[PDB]
């Protein structure tokens, strides 16, 4: 069980850790989050009480180093940092725990939600989508644009999601125009799975990461990426049976977890209606179709 200590909480802020969140008051004696489950990526995220604009946060894995949060009054945000001195860090964490100034990661034992949302998500893959190689953790916020959004402006602060474009030479073999446009199996299986992602695990990892960025930061480009990766599978007539069964589970937990009130901005009507009712895979996402029909029948 790992710990992310906070030096202090000088400004009033809603702090999220994965799907959980806590209101902290200005100069409240808050010194961090303990009992963080080892074996998963995590995200610690912020929304200032004074600017409900810019949700921002940090993807990390406690196995990769000792991370803490410290408010920077110049840049005006909570920053993640690595403590390289193991003894200084254990000494800081033991003190804060003794004084019970830390919240406990509030995992219910029965609850596999976070595992289910992060099953394929790997810190090494996150660090290639979010490039800042001098840190072991990854900063994401509401406003960061994707490589694809930039093509259609600061590349240092971009989300480098795999570009998916259904009307591209990459997606359409010369001489198979109609076949490849109506059945995207060659784009999914040869270009994307065999070619770029290497396996379905890396593909699902980026799909899950895009969803979580959309949900936790309202990152519009991430939402575009999540939908494109869903639509590429559902629009393929030929998908490995293990991929369809896994996609149904992945989407089920994403829809289950989404705030009921955010369905209007985070869910693309055309993609979902196409995927559940028209696509080749219309009959292959039973759990996802059942949760969508019972939770968001308006959207459909």
């Amino acid at each position: 069980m790992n710990t992310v200590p906070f030096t202090s909480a000088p400004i009033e802020v809603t702090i999220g850790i994965d799907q959980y969140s806590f209101n902290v008051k200005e100069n409240q004696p808050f010194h961090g989050i303990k009992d963080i489950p080892i074996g998963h990526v995590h995200v610690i995220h912020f929304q200032h009480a004074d600017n409900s604009s810019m949700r921002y946060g940090y993807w990390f894995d406690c196995r990769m180093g000792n991370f803490y949060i410290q408010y920077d009054p110049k840049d005006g945000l909570y920053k993640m940092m690595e403590e390289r001195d193991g003894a200084k860090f254990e000494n800081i964490v033991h003190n804060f725990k003794e004084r019970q100034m830390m919240v406990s990661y509030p995992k219910i034992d029965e609850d596999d939600t976070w595992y289910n949302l992060t099953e394929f998500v790997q810190m090494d893959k996150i660090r290639k989508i979010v490039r800042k190689d001098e840190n072991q953790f990854s900063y994401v916020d509401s406003s960061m644009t994707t490589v694809q959004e930039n093509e259609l402006s600061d590349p240092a602060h971009s989300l480098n999601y795999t570009v998916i474009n259904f009307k591209s030479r990459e997606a359409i073999r010369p001489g198979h125009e109609m076949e490849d446009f109506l059945d995207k199996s060659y784009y999914l299986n040869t270009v994307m799975l065999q070619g770029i992602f290497k396996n379905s695990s890396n593909y699902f990892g980026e799909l899950q990461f895009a969803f979580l960025n959309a949900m936790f930061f309202g990152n519009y480009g991430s939402s575009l990426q999540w939908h494109a990766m869903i639509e590429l599978i559902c629009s393929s007539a030929t998908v490995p049976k293990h991929m369809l069964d896994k996609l149904d589970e992945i989407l089920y937990y994403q829809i289950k977890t989404l705030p009921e009130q955010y369905s209007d901005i985070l869910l693309n009507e055309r993609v979902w209606n196409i995927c559940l009712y028209s696509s080749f895979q219309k009959n292959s996402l039973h759990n996802t179709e059942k949760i969508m029909e019972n939770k968001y029948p308006e959207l459909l």
Partner: protein, 237 residues
Amino acid sequence: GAMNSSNYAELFNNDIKLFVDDTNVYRVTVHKTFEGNVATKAINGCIFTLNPKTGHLFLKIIHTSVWAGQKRLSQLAKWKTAEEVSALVRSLPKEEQPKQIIVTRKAMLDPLEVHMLDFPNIAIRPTELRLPFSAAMSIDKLSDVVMKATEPQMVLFNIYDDWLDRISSYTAFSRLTLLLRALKTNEESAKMILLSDPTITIKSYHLWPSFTDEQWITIESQMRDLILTEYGRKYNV
């Protein structure tokens, strides 16, 4: 974006552009079977690809053999159209390639865009205009070459005959759309108007009769009258 009443004059500027109409690509007769079910028999069709500035018509004849053993033909017809237009563009010298292709039907946008990925600088555009190019098969000489085709064939016409010697492209296109609109609304009446005077003939190398400027004014008046009558009837106004 979309071609409409507002940006009409763009059709007659010096940027090469083509209209593509796919209406007559997939043509069928519907009939009863012996068992009293319904079946279709395909007949020869055509792609109507027109330079509205020059009058050059690229009439790609679609022989019924292209449908043999194919499913979902009304869908295939859009992709076959897009394949043939793309092949036409690739066959033209660079300085003759269009800068824009305007499709008369929005269902052609995706098929044409995907076939033209090699030409990212050629803009594929819809139109808000209700163009009567479906009536091309009411032009006797175009109908004759489509129906006689025994194989895929491209036939080149000037749909304006020699009009551009006397009138502007704008005026030539207005006359063409008025003739086709008439032929579309009441073919029998429209064709009666065009041939009633046996002294006015169609040259072997032309599609329409050899009217004087004065006779075109009378003809154009008779076509407008035909169209408004039919409108009152259609609608009871």
